[PDB]
Amino acid sequence: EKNERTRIKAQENLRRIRRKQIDLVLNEYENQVALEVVAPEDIPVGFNDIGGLDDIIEELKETIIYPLTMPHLYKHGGALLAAPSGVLLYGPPGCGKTMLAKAVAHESGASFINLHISTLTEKWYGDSNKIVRAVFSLAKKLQPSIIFIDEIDAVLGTRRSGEHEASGMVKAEFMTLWDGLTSTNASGVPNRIVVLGATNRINDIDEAILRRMPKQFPVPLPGLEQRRRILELVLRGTKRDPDFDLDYIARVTAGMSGSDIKETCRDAAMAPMREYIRQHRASGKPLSEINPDDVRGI
Amino acid sequence: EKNERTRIKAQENLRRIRRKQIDLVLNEYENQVALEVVAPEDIPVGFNDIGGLDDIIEELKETIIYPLTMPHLYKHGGALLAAPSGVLLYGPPGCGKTMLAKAVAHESGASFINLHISTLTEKWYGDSNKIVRAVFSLAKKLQPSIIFIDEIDAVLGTRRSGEHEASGMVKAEFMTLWDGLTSTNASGVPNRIVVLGATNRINDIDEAILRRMPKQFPVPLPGLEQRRRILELVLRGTKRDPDFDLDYIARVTAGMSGSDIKETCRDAAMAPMREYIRQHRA
Amino acid sequence: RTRIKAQENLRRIRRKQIDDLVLNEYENQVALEVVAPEDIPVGFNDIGGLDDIIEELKETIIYPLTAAPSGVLLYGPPGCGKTMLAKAVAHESGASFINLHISTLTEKWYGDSNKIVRAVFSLAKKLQPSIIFIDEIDAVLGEASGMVKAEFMTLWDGVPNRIVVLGATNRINDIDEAILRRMPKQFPVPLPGLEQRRRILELVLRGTKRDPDFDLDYIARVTAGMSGSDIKETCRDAAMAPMREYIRQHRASGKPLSEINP
Amino acid sequence: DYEKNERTRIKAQENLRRIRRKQLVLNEYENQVALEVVAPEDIPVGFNDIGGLDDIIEELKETIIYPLTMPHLYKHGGALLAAPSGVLLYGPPGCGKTMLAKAVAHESGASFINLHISTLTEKWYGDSNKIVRAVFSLAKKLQPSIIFIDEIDAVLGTRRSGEHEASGMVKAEFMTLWDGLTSTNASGVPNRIVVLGATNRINDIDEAILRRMPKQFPVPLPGLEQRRRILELVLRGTKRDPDFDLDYIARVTAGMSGSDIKETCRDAAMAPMREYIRQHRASGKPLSEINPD
Amino acid sequence: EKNERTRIKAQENLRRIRRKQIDLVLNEYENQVALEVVAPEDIPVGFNDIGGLDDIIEELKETIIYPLTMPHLYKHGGALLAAPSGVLLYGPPGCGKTMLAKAVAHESGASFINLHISTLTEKWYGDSNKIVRAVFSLAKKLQPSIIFIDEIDAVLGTRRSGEHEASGMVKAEFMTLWDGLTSTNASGVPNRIVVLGATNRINDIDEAILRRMPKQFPVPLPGLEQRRRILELVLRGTKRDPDFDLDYIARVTAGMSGSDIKETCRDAAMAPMREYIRQ
Amino acid sequence: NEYENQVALEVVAPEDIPVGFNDIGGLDDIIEELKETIIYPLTMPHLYKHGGALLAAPSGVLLYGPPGCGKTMLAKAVAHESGASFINLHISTLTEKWYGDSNKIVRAVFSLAKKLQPSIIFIDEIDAVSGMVKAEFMTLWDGLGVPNRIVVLGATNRINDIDEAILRRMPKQFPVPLPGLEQRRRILELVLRGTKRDPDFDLDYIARVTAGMSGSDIKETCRDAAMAPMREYIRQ
Ligand SMILES: Nc1ncnc2c1ncn2[C@@H]1O[C@H](COP(=O)(O)OP(=O)(O)O)[C@@H](O)[C@H]1O
Ligand SMILES: Nc1ncnc2c1ncn2[C@@H]1O[C@H](COP(=O)(O)OP(=O)(O)O)[C@@H](O)[C@H]1O
Ligand SMILES: Nc1ncnc2c1ncn2[C@@H]1O[C@H](COP(=O)(O)OP(=O)(O)O)[C@@H](O)[C@H]1O
Ligand SMILES: Nc1ncnc2c1ncn2[C@@H]1O[C@H](COP(=O)(O)OP(=O)(O)O)[C@@H](O)[C@H]1O
Ligand SMILES: Nc1ncnc2c1ncn2[C@@H]1O[C@H](COP(=O)(O)OP(=O)(O)O)[C@@H](O)[C@H]1O
Ligand code: BEF
Ligand code: BEF
Ligand code: BEF
Ligand code: BEF
Ligand SMILES: [Mg+2]
Ligand SMILES: [Mg+2]
Ligand SMILES: [Mg+2]
């Protein structure tokens, strides 16, 4: 058992040496959680990349990140003016949610970690709660640490019964360290830990935990202006302006969500590429030139 | 296994000394339960700064927390006139059942130990029952003690058929050491140990545990006066805006929880604060 | 292990003498569970007007050990005083009252999960009379749990050694029917009747005065539903009420010193 | 409790050596899928054995299977001109939905990985997700990779909150690894992993899974020409008689699937051999007759 | 735990030793179905015993068993002349829909493996799919492999929106392992394993499973002479009293489906038996 | 074989049964056909095996009619009559707890039966026999070189909606009419065998007093008028 745990420890120590740069002491449980500390330089989508929703970026930055990072600015107010306990981005499926949980991990600089729901559920008994305590132990040892759990309605969410007698503890031993008797320091700082969460079913997330994460922003499907921005941003790397008429495309795709505009642009961005390939299919060898032309998709 | 256990017992010694002094020995096995003894001065809350709850904040101070400390003035009776062995603290989420426990831990005087859920369920076989036993063996060593299992719905609960019976042995261990044949003392005192619970749904905690906790304090949602008090109480750091009328936001809450009110009042203190972004501008 | 065997020797001497014989180290560790008869303060008189199941015990269990069936069950639900009955039996029993403390059987080893099970019956064979009462018997008698269960049921039916089995499960009809059928007897403990609830009123009300409240007789009018534990907690509350009033009055001024009246 | 690991780990390397030698190190749960990759030389069918699907075989080849391999060809706007992260083959049961994926596992070149729904659902707690992030970690190691979940509407479905919670995490684990936070690289390349899915019932898969896989190819029943071509493809094992209108069978079918036609051809072809057996002969005989019905 | 698995391995080894010669490695899943491979000599019924449905027993002996065993004579065809991978025989309750399975298991070398519904339904999550997979992993390892799912309309069935979780991924996994990715071999052989489905109503079995059982032999009620055939065959070694014949009873037995005749005749068989007790 | 050991709690022993064959109420023709064709061939088959492969006892026998105790009494009695250990279904055990727990029970029942002597299985209040249990109960009753040597009995008030395929496999379906104007005399004699019968009138109006009820009022009248002249003898 030690032969595997040593390599594990070496890997997480390497990851944390890469992250911490601009050497902790770790037990075995939150050791393997150190593999989930996302390096902020490995998420190539900032806040200037996601168009459409902008006010949600406003209320997501100037009330969550400025409270977490640079807390001295929010000390004149007192104990109230701190970062909220947790955040939730609920809305229709496939519009900016997981991609807005990337810019918050790239520019925030708050020791972001992706929780990886599988790791919460361990096979041995009493090791699915050791990891739930470890995710907060490591979160506070390198605070201010943002935590993220995508799809929070399976690992979290309404119990409705004693499922398996091991899923009611991760739902409870998470809530015990979240906003429990040790959530506040001896002076008042609540450890500076904000757990995000993405979900399209807000009404299945254990409303007792709904009190836990109050900053719950609705992430609606993009409107007409939001789509006119998402087309401009998704169609950056495309020699697409012979006689391009984006006003028609941003209007016709009204009912379409914000994640299908990407695939629509993809089909409308490799159509002339397929034309060039089928043209070159006559003879020769694939040594692709840079002369397709995007005009109109479907 | 021993060196790491030696570090565990060393940290346990430090925490126990800082709790006691405000000297004893252990078995090198129950040290991992004294690593949750909450100190008295670190909990920054008290019974004075919790508006709303009044009959609870008085009934706890008179009936449970303070027949325990200074029990000499209740020594006229036998088993009676003693600390009631058990408390529940049930209520909806976000109404001050954890803050109440924090204030109890800070203003009690008994050796408050915070028994987590991850400290009872153990991987090795037979290493989860001897921790539930270590808890009640430590509570009796120094026995002003308020054990506190927060969120008693997973660690405890209605024992159903099967469901990892090794996890049912823990609840059986609680049932047998809590009020079993050796519950009280040979002199008659019931060891002066009062577990404090916490939950949002009193429907599956237990029927064989409700008897084991005679007190059940219902903490409901704050009404008119409770919200009027909590709104004034939360605004102790944030300076009051000039001409700001409190009763409007006080009455407009109208049944909202005791934490959502805190968030809506935090927004009203960050609103102007966020607005003054001029320092970088200038 | 040396400290373990030393404490074992001391506790077993204080149990037996009211001598001692050295035995296996994996069998001494269960010998630290022998509570002396003078350790329990309560007695038979501390039980209410039950005097039927306690009478059955007094006639059928303690007498033969002075044949004695091996196995006795406590059937009542939580609230009637199963553990209280067991504690009272342990006082006026005169035999060797040895509990189990199932955590003692549970061990993080492979070949040691059966040695303690052997050691319990071995020590029972060493000294008589003996008592192996195990509260919450529907906890351990549900490759380790099954092994310990099978080995316990193997040596369960070990003069028939003067060994007695007493069970106090909080719930029945879902409890070890393989061995529950083997045990001879089982005594149900129902809710308190009229005379039973009257005795419960008269017993717990021992230290408090007779006029701290309305009256004792009227309390035995709605307490029919509640059990012996809810009645005791309500009595504790009603007793603390007058002392509550007195302490609240004394809060006005004066050092918080004890008194000699409510 | 250790020999099972040794057996799977030794066979895990041996299975990978086959696909590797056709042209690495894995942890515990990755050995499960390590015994699960399909070598393209093993499957005996190719793209030229699926008739009538000239508009689906051509769109499963220009936009989903050949932006993926040789991605250097698509590097002008590579951030967007990549292979889709999944494909949904849906339609009437019995036409190509498994044959297309069987030929894609043969004539693609990518490390095709079948998913085998029984292996995702372990009886222990948490192994169902340890296998999901094992397959979505082996695909990244065997990149480029192609995952195929035949009949996706069984292992995946609408959440249905009042059901088994342990099976709502594997359905909520694809939404975390297959398009989650780490679906992209440090520069934009989304791991070059496409997940194939063939369901006989679309719209009962999910409201969120139907956006991950952006290429839902509907595979209709064989029309007037699909039957004509499937007859040609199927009746190439035994010789044909000098005169029989094979158009007649296709011209009269008009309502059968791609499997019903194969079964009818099987029933028709057995007539001459069963007649030769009616002649009570023991040895073989290379002549027969494939007359209509 | 381990001892139970070792005992199951001992049973499977004994059963394979007794069934193979009129032995291969097995896990603890396909071992569970190892106890289901019946011995041909156990079933005391042959093809000659079945009557009435004489034109269904013929097409099963020429298009299923012959294309399954000794296919070298059928090797002249490439792949079309293999055995049909699935066979269904439906009928009203009271006809020969199960006795045909016995005749196929007894007088046709097939490694007949009947799987019971309780051998598929299980308590642990993902333990039923790993048995549906073990079945087809065993049938491949010994592959005459005539699998027989009687009352298939229950173990399978119509898949709905509000369908049970565990019972919904065992219908899809089964029909995916039947005709799926690994259905064929490297050489292109169809991997001969036939599945016998014997249901009472082919209306709700599935829309995708009926194609997986292309041979659907209808088993109607016993015909006029067919009932006479069953009468003459069921009372071969029975009582032989004077001239009174079942042919008159055959005309009398207009209804009284084929299963019912086997008890009608036995009830009529106590005529000389009852008087023997009169001593 | 954990389930067959679990079902071993309901295997009533073939001996020490309350059968007492004469105690059953007045029922001759049904019991005549029973003792002639079912229980008789169960014992000493060597004297009944003159014809082979067909003289096995059919495992289908139904007792349909209003609810009562005679059908259950007859089921209890036939076991001791043929030296059979009564293994009741215990239909409340058919409730579902796990996914396939009940199907395991249905398998283990026939497992123990085939492993056991010719005792007969009983299904009290047959109404459950539409999932895997209902499927597998029709399968393992008759399925894949010796007869079953065990008969299944049918006891249920429900008729013509009881899965007629199961009705097909129930050859000797016997109507069990509990209310009988002649069986009532015998059952009242059975009752009054021990009860003191000095003051009460002759057993003639009893044949018309409990005319409506089938077999329950007669069973409750064992002590209905028994203690009526008995309270005074007990109080004084
Ligand atoms: N507002 C947006 N601006 C730009 N791209 C978007 C936006 N919303 C969705 N997308 C596209 O959707 C893809 C990821 O979708 P995602 O936001 O993860 O869905 P969900 O909202 O369910 O998390 C990205 O590739 C991105 O291009
Ligand atoms: N009675 C109260 N007065 C003031 N604030 C309260 C009160 N109850 C709860 N809160 C606020 O709620 C937060 C913690 O709530 P918590 O005690 O966890 O709710 P619950 O006890 O219902 O779980 C604290 O930050 C505190 O400010
Ligand atoms: N028969 C009785 N008469 C009077 N009081 C009783 C009786 N039984 C129980 N009690 C009271 O109720 C309480 C029951 O507590 P306990 O014996 O621990 O319950 P249990 O035995 O169910 O664990 C005792 O403290 C005792 O004072
Ligand atoms: N376009 C086609 N050309 C040739 N054969 C086909 C075609 N479509 C289906 N088939 C036949 O169908 C059989 C497999 O059907 P499959 O596609 O697996 O059905 P499903 O889509 O329900 O999985 C193969 O044996 C093949 O001969
Ligand atoms: N021709 C026949 N000869 C002998 N037995 C028959 C014949 N037809 C039906 N049976 C009997 O009828 C019973 C029921 O038929 P079966 O095929 O099992 O239908 P099901 O599967 O619906 O029960 C069988 O057990 C069989 O013994
Ligand atoms: F598609 Be996202 F991850 F909800
Ligand atoms: F939020 Be408390 F701990 F219920
Ligand atoms: F109710 Be106690 F556990 F006997
Ligand atoms: F494989 Be098919 F789509 F059932
Ligand atoms: Mg709280
Ligand atoms: Mg007790
Ligand atoms: Mg398929």
Coordinates of N, CA, C and O in Angstrom, one line a residue, chain E residues 4 7 38 42-44 93-94 98 101-102 112 114 116-118 120-123 128 148 150-151 154 164 166-167 170 200 234-235 237-238 257 259-260 262-263 265-267 269-270 273-274 276-277, chain F residues 1-3 32-33 36-37 40 47-52 54-58 98-101 103-104 107 130-132 134-146 164-165 168-169 171-172:
Chain E
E4 N -17.4 -19.5 0.1 CA -18.5 -19.7 -0.8 C -18.1 -19.7 -2.3 O -18.6 -20.5 -3.1
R7 N -16.5 -23.0 -3.1 CA -17.5 -24.0 -3.2 C -18.2 -23.9 -4.5 O -18.5 -25.0 -5.2
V38 N -27.2 -27.6 -18.3 CA -27.8 -28.8 -18.0 C -27.2 -30.0 -18.8 O -26.6 -29.7 -19.9
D42 N -30.1 -35.7 -18.8 CA -31.0 -35.5 -17.7 C -32.5 -35.4 -18.2 O -33.4 -36.0 -17.7
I43 N -32.7 -34.6 -19.3 CA -34.0 -34.3 -19.8 C -34.5 -35.6 -20.5 O -34.0 -36.0 -21.5
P44 N -35.6 -36.2 -19.9 CA -36.1 -37.5 -20.4 C -37.1 -37.4 -21.5 O -38.2 -38.0 -21.5
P93 N -50.6 -20.5 -23.5 CA -50.2 -21.4 -22.4 C -51.0 -22.7 -22.4 O -52.3 -22.7 -22.2
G94 N -50.4 -23.8 -22.8 CA -51.1 -25.1 -22.9 C -50.7 -25.9 -24.1 O -51.3 -26.9 -24.4
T98 N -42.4 -25.2 -24.1 CA -41.3 -25.5 -23.2 C -40.7 -26.9 -23.5 O -39.5 -27.1 -23.4
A101 N -38.0 -27.0 -25.9 CA -36.7 -26.6 -25.3 C -36.0 -27.9 -24.8 O -34.8 -28.1 -24.9
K102 N -36.8 -28.7 -24.1 CA -36.3 -30.0 -23.5 C -35.7 -30.9 -24.7 O -34.7 -31.5 -24.6
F112 N -26.5 -26.8 -23.7 CA -27.7 -26.0 -23.4 C -27.6 -25.4 -22.0 O -27.4 -26.0 -21.0
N114 N -29.8 -22.9 -19.6 CA -31.0 -22.2 -19.3 C -30.7 -21.3 -18.1 O -30.1 -21.7 -17.1
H116 N -32.1 -18.8 -15.3 CA -33.3 -18.4 -14.5 C -33.3 -16.9 -14.2 O -32.3 -16.3 -14.2
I117 N -34.6 -16.4 -14.0 CA -34.7 -14.9 -13.8 C -34.0 -14.5 -12.5 O -33.4 -13.4 -12.5
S118 N -34.0 -15.4 -11.5 CA -33.3 -15.0 -10.3 C -31.8 -15.1 -10.4 O -31.1 -14.5 -9.6
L120 N -30.4 -13.7 -12.8 CA -30.1 -12.4 -13.4 C -30.5 -11.2 -12.5 O -29.7 -10.3 -12.4
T121 N -31.6 -11.2 -11.9 CA -32.0 -10.2 -10.9 C -31.1 -10.4 -9.7 O -30.9 -11.5 -9.2
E122 N -30.5 -9.3 -9.2 CA -29.6 -9.4 -8.1 C -29.8 -8.1 -7.2 O -30.5 -7.2 -7.6
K123 N -29.1 -8.1 -6.1 CA -29.3 -7.0 -5.1 C -28.2 -5.9 -5.4 O -28.5 -4.7 -5.3
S128 N -26.2 -7.5 -12.1 CA -27.0 -8.1 -13.1 C -26.5 -8.0 -14.5 O -26.5 -8.9 -15.3
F148 N -31.7 -20.4 -23.5 CA -33.1 -20.5 -23.5 C -33.7 -19.6 -22.4 O -33.5 -19.9 -21.2
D150 N -37.1 -18.7 -21.1 CA -38.5 -18.9 -21.1 C -39.2 -17.8 -20.4 O -38.6 -17.2 -19.4
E151 N -40.4 -17.4 -20.8 CA -41.1 -16.3 -20.3 C -40.3 -15.0 -20.5 O -40.1 -14.2 -19.6
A154 N -41.1 -11.2 -19.6 CA -40.9 -10.6 -18.3 C -39.5 -10.2 -18.0 O -39.3 -9.0 -17.6
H164 N -37.8 0.8 -14.3 CA -36.9 0.6 -13.2 C -35.5 0.7 -13.7 O -35.1 0.4 -14.8
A166 N -32.4 -0.7 -12.6 CA -31.6 -2.0 -12.8 C -32.3 -2.9 -13.9 O -31.5 -3.5 -14.6
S167 N -33.6 -2.9 -13.9 CA -34.3 -3.7 -15.0 C -34.2 -3.0 -16.3 O -34.7 -3.6 -17.3
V170 N -30.4 -3.9 -18.0 CA -30.2 -5.3 -18.3 C -30.9 -5.8 -19.6 O -30.6 -6.8 -20.1
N200 N -45.6 -16.2 -24.0 CA -47.0 -16.4 -24.2 C -47.7 -15.4 -25.1 O -48.8 -15.6 -25.6
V234 N -49.0 -39.9 -25.7 CA -48.9 -39.7 -24.2 C -49.3 -41.0 -23.5 O -49.0 -41.1 -22.3
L235 N -50.1 -41.9 -24.1 CA -50.6 -43.1 -23.4 C -49.9 -44.4 -24.0 O -50.5 -45.4 -24.1
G237 N -47.1 -46.3 -23.0 CA -46.9 -47.3 -22.0 C -47.9 -47.4 -20.9 O -47.7 -47.9 -19.8
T238 N -49.1 -46.8 -21.2 CA -50.2 -46.7 -20.2 C -51.1 -47.9 -20.2 O -50.8 -48.9 -20.8
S257 N -56.8 -27.7 -24.6 CA -55.5 -27.5 -25.2 C -54.5 -28.6 -24.8 O -54.7 -29.3 -23.8
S259 N -51.7 -29.1 -23.4 CA -51.3 -29.3 -22.0 C -52.4 -29.9 -21.2 O -52.1 -30.8 -20.3
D260 N -53.6 -29.6 -21.4 CA -54.7 -30.1 -20.6 C -55.0 -31.6 -20.9 O -55.5 -32.3 -20.0
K262 N -52.8 -33.9 -21.1 CA -52.0 -34.8 -20.3 C -52.5 -35.1 -18.9 O -52.2 -36.1 -18.3
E263 N -53.4 -34.2 -18.4 CA -54.1 -34.4 -17.2 C -55.4 -35.0 -17.4 O -55.9 -35.8 -16.5
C265 N -56.2 -37.3 -19.6 CA -55.9 -38.7 -19.8 C -55.5 -39.4 -18.5 O -56.0 -40.5 -18.2
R266 N -54.7 -38.7 -17.7 CA -54.3 -39.3 -16.4 C -55.5 -39.4 -15.5 O -55.7 -40.4 -14.7
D267 N -56.4 -38.4 -15.5 CA -57.7 -38.5 -14.7 C -58.5 -39.7 -15.2 O -59.2 -40.3 -14.4
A269 N -57.3 -42.3 -16.2 CA -56.5 -43.5 -16.0 C -56.7 -44.3 -14.7 O -56.1 -45.3 -14.5
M270 N -57.6 -43.8 -13.8 CA -57.8 -44.4 -12.5 C -59.1 -45.3 -12.5 O -59.6 -45.6 -11.5
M273 N -57.7 -48.6 -11.4 CA -56.9 -48.3 -10.2 C -57.8 -48.2 -9.0 O -57.4 -48.6 -7.9
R274 N -58.9 -47.5 -9.1 CA -59.7 -47.2 -7.9 C -60.3 -48.4 -7.3 O -60.4 -48.5 -6.0
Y276 N -58.9 -51.3 -7.0 CA -57.9 -52.1 -6.4 C -57.8 -51.8 -4.9 O -57.4 -52.6 -4.1
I277 N -58.2 -50.6 -4.5 CA -58.2 -50.2 -3.1 C -59.4 -50.8 -2.3 O -59.3 -50.8 -1.1
Chain F
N1 N -27.1 -21.2 -0.7 CA -28.5 -21.7 -0.3 C -29.0 -20.9 1.0 O -29.6 -21.5 1.8
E2 N -28.6 -19.6 1.0 CA -29.0 -18.8 2.2 C -30.5 -18.6 2.2 O -31.1 -18.6 3.3
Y3 N -31.2 -18.5 1.0 CA -32.6 -18.3 1.0 C -33.4 -19.5 1.4 O -34.4 -19.4 2.1
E32 N -62.8 -37.2 -0.6 CA -62.7 -38.5 -1.2 C -61.8 -38.5 -2.5 O -60.9 -39.3 -2.6
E33 N -62.1 -37.5 -3.4 CA -61.2 -37.4 -4.6 C -59.8 -37.1 -4.2 O -58.8 -37.6 -4.8
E36 N -58.1 -40.2 -2.8 CA -58.1 -41.2 -3.9 C -56.9 -40.9 -4.8 O -56.2 -41.8 -5.2
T37 N -56.8 -39.6 -5.3 CA -56.0 -39.3 -6.5 C -54.7 -38.5 -6.1 O -53.8 -38.5 -7.0
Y40 N -53.0 -40.4 -1.9 CA -52.8 -41.9 -2.1 C -51.6 -42.2 -2.9 O -50.8 -43.0 -2.5
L47 N -46.8 -49.4 -5.2 CA -48.2 -50.0 -5.4 C -49.0 -49.2 -6.3 O -50.1 -49.7 -6.7
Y48 N -48.6 -48.0 -6.7 CA -49.3 -47.2 -7.7 C -48.6 -47.0 -9.0 O -49.2 -46.4 -9.9
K49 N -47.3 -47.4 -9.1 CA -46.5 -47.2 -10.3 C -46.7 -48.3 -11.3 O -45.7 -48.5 -12.1
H50 N -47.9 -48.9 -11.4 CA -48.1 -49.9 -12.4 C -48.0 -49.3 -13.8 O -47.5 -50.0 -14.7
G51 N -48.3 -48.0 -14.0 CA -48.1 -47.3 -15.2 C -47.0 -46.2 -15.0 O -47.1 -45.4 -14.0
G52 N -46.0 -46.2 -15.9 CA -44.9 -45.3 -15.7 C -45.0 -44.0 -16.6 O -45.7 -44.0 -17.6
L54 N -46.6 -41.4 -16.2 CA -47.9 -40.7 -16.2 C -48.6 -40.7 -14.9 O -49.5 -39.8 -14.7
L55 N -48.4 -41.6 -14.0 CA -49.1 -41.7 -12.7 C -48.6 -40.8 -11.6 O -48.8 -41.1 -10.5
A56 N -47.8 -39.8 -12.0 CA -47.3 -38.9 -11.0 C -48.5 -38.0 -10.5 O -49.4 -37.7 -11.3
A57 N -48.4 -37.6 -9.3 CA -49.4 -36.7 -8.7 C -49.4 -35.3 -9.3 O -48.3 -34.7 -9.2
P58 N -50.4 -34.8 -9.9 CA -50.4 -33.5 -10.5 C -50.3 -32.4 -9.5 O -51.0 -32.4 -8.5
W98 N -35.0 -5.8 -1.6 CA -33.9 -5.6 -2.6 C -34.5 -5.7 -4.0 O -35.7 -5.9 -4.2
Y99 N -33.6 -5.7 -5.0 CA -34.0 -5.8 -6.4 C -34.6 -7.2 -6.7 O -35.7 -7.4 -7.2
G100 N -33.8 -8.2 -6.4 CA -34.2 -9.6 -6.7 C -34.3 -10.5 -5.5 O -34.2 -11.7 -5.6
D101 N -34.6 -9.9 -4.3 CA -34.7 -10.7 -3.1 C -35.9 -11.6 -3.1 O -35.8 -12.8 -2.7
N103 N -37.4 -12.8 -5.8 CA -37.2 -13.9 -6.8 C -36.3 -14.9 -6.3 O -36.4 -16.1 -6.5
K104 N -35.3 -14.5 -5.5 CA -34.4 -15.5 -4.8 C -35.3 -16.4 -3.9 O -35.0 -17.6 -3.7
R107 N -37.2 -18.9 -5.9 CA -36.2 -20.0 -6.4 C -35.9 -20.9 -5.2 O -36.0 -22.1 -5.4
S130 N -46.9 -8.5 -11.1 CA -46.7 -9.1 -12.4 C -45.3 -8.9 -12.9 O -45.0 -8.6 -14.0
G131 N -44.4 -9.1 -11.9 CA -42.9 -8.9 -12.2 C -42.2 -10.2 -12.4 O -42.7 -11.2 -12.8
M132 N -40.9 -10.2 -12.0 CA -40.0 -11.3 -12.1 C -40.5 -12.5 -11.3 O -40.4 -13.6 -11.7
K134 N -43.8 -13.2 -10.5 CA -44.9 -13.8 -11.2 C -44.4 -14.5 -12.4 O -45.0 -15.5 -12.8
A135 N -43.3 -14.0 -13.1 CA -42.8 -14.7 -14.2 C -42.2 -16.1 -13.7 O -42.5 -17.1 -14.2
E136 N -41.3 -16.0 -12.8 CA -40.5 -17.2 -12.4 C -41.3 -18.2 -11.7 O -41.0 -19.4 -11.8
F137 N -42.4 -17.8 -11.0 CA -43.3 -18.8 -10.4 C -44.0 -19.8 -11.4 O -44.3 -20.9 -11.1
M138 N -44.3 -19.3 -12.6 CA -44.8 -20.1 -13.7 C -43.7 -20.9 -14.3 O -44.0 -22.0 -14.9
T139 N -42.5 -20.5 -14.3 CA -41.4 -21.2 -14.9 C -41.0 -22.4 -14.1 O -41.0 -23.5 -14.6
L140 N -40.6 -22.2 -12.8 CA -40.0 -23.2 -12.0 C -41.0 -24.2 -11.5 O -40.6 -25.2 -10.9
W141 N -42.3 -23.9 -11.7 CA -43.3 -24.9 -11.4 C -43.2 -26.1 -12.3 O -43.3 -27.3 -11.9
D142 N -42.9 -25.9 -13.6 CA -42.7 -27.0 -14.6 C -41.6 -26.4 -15.6 O -41.9 -25.5 -16.3
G143 N -40.5 -27.0 -15.6 CA -39.4 -26.6 -16.5 C -38.3 -27.6 -16.8 O -38.6 -28.8 -16.8
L144 N -37.1 -27.1 -17.0 CA -36.0 -27.9 -17.5 C -35.4 -28.6 -16.3 O -36.0 -29.3 -15.5
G145 N -35.4 -36.9 -15.1 CA -36.0 -38.1 -15.5 C -36.9 -38.7 -14.4 O -37.0 -39.9 -14.2
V146 N -37.6 -37.8 -13.7 CA -38.4 -38.2 -12.6 C -39.5 -37.1 -12.4 O -39.2 -35.9 -12.5
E164 N -55.0 -17.4 -15.9 CA -55.5 -18.7 -16.5 C -54.4 -19.7 -16.9 O -54.6 -20.9 -16.9
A165 N -53.3 -19.2 -17.4 CA -52.1 -20.1 -17.6 C -51.8 -20.8 -16.3 O -51.5 -22.0 -16.4
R168 N -54.4 -23.2 -16.1 CA -54.1 -24.4 -16.9 C -53.3 -25.4 -16.1 O -53.6 -26.6 -16.1
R169 N -52.3 -24.9 -15.3 CA -51.4 -25.8 -14.5 C -52.1 -26.2 -13.2 O -51.4 -26.7 -12.3
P171 N -54.8 -28.6 -12.4 CA -55.7 -29.6 -12.9 C -56.9 -29.9 -12.0 O -58.1 -29.7 -12.4
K172 N -56.7 -30.2 -10.8 CA -57.7 -30.6 -9.8 C -58.1 -29.4 -9.0 O -57.8 -29.2 -7.8

